[PDB]
Design a protein around this ligand. Structure first.
Ligand SMILES: [Cl-]
Ligand SMILES: [Cl-]
Ligand SMILES: [Cl-]
Ligand SMILES: [Cl-]
Lengths: 229, 229
């Protein structure tokens, strides 16, 4: 196969810049592709280089209304696994029907639904010429993700697996250690609340960083205000 | 002549608590009454005690979906005044057809459209049993606001009139001077970006405070992140 060549490529475009996660799941007040599209326009207008979004409907809306590069995921619970970020080939194939340039998945050590193997997911993503991002929780998971052929790794799941560091703040140590150790881009994602934390993540050698709720979850932002009173 | 009595009253409800301003004008990405309603629900769920909102459509939606106390305004440009926050009786009457418990208006020293005066607006608001908030820019405007019978004063316009302090951060100086001089509630509003600033406003004697864009304008929030890179 062949296709025409683009001047801009996603990893180059996000380097040194901000990615904004625009997510709102069914139990959140902004659950709506319409609203996530508007959040992404806001993000774009505020200088975001790319968007991370969940679900086919939100991804398609955001692409239409912003034309930004997208990291797409589908979050889905399975009865036979603890993994929920793009757990199986079913979600990969659903995502491949969208135009998102990168697909992120859980690349933890954990058993996937139906006994599926994360290498098969990465290979399917690459077979359609897309990029794969490994959402990890530990240093060793990042190492293995590079070995598996992921295009980049993200610290998304640190603090969201039982055996990873439990914290209410950014996991900067995992960031620094991944930067000591893997060659592929390391993206800092998880609990970035302040511009100072963002700048610190980049200063520590994050290739790029993702800010989510601190921009796109007004409930969370509001609670951070009311908590100090 | 009379009405049933309520247990909860707006000034008591906001005392020591957060008020969230949920506004998106026509040139802003979240412009939509539906969206502002969803933002207000998020704010409510994050602990906001009341909402400040703009326009009859957004006020009515927010009221319907949150049942929170509302500070209502209408922003409208007139060719014969610099004032745009609830400038004339026309806007006051439009607002009085909503259920908003408090109406805020520009209470600066500036000339209003059609040569109208602030006192007449306050009196009309009080004649329908509603509360009036004075958005001011200087200590002297706040002192006059109290004299005119406003129920409370807010520092909303400090730095948004040419004769007031020009600043890109909260005007704590004006807050402190007002608290020590006027007896009615003084509300801190304007450029509150961080929980630490909110806490400081209350610690300096603010009766309550209003946070807007730092919760409900994702473009502005995003720009504060990107500005640091
Ligand atoms: Cl995520
Ligand atoms: Cl939210
Ligand atoms: Cl306002
Ligand atoms: Cl915005």
């Amino acid at each position: 196969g062949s296709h025409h060549h683009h001047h801009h490529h996603m990893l180059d475009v996000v380097k040194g810049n901000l990615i904004v996660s625009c997510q709102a799941l069914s139990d959140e007040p902004l659950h709506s592709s319409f609203i996530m599209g508007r959040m992404a326009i806001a993000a774009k207008q505020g200088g975001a280089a790319a968007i991370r979004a969940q679900g086919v409907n939100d991804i398609n809306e955001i692409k239409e209304v912003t034309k930004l590069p997208i990291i797409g995921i589908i979050k889905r619970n399975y009865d036979d696994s603890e993994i929920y970020i793009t757990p199986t080939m079913k979600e990969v194939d659903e995502l491949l029907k969208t135009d998102c340039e990168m697909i992120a998945l859980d690349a933890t050590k954990r058993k996937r639904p139906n006994g599926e193997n994360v290498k098969d997911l990465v290979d399917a993503i690459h077979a359609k010429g897309r990029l794969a991002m490994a959402d990890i929780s530990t240093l060793e998971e990042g190492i293995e993700a590079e070995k598996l052929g992921f295009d980049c790794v993200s610290t998304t799941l640190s603090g969201y697996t039982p055996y990873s560091k439990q914290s209410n703040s950014v996991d900067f140590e995992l960031l620094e250690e991944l930067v000591k150790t893997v060659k592929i881009p390391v993206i800092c994602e998880g609990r970035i609340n302040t511009p100072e934390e963002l700048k610190k993540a980049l200063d520590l050698g994050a290739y790029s960083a993702v800010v989510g709720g601190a921009i796109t979850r007004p409930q969370q932002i509001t609670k951070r205000f009311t908590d100090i009173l």
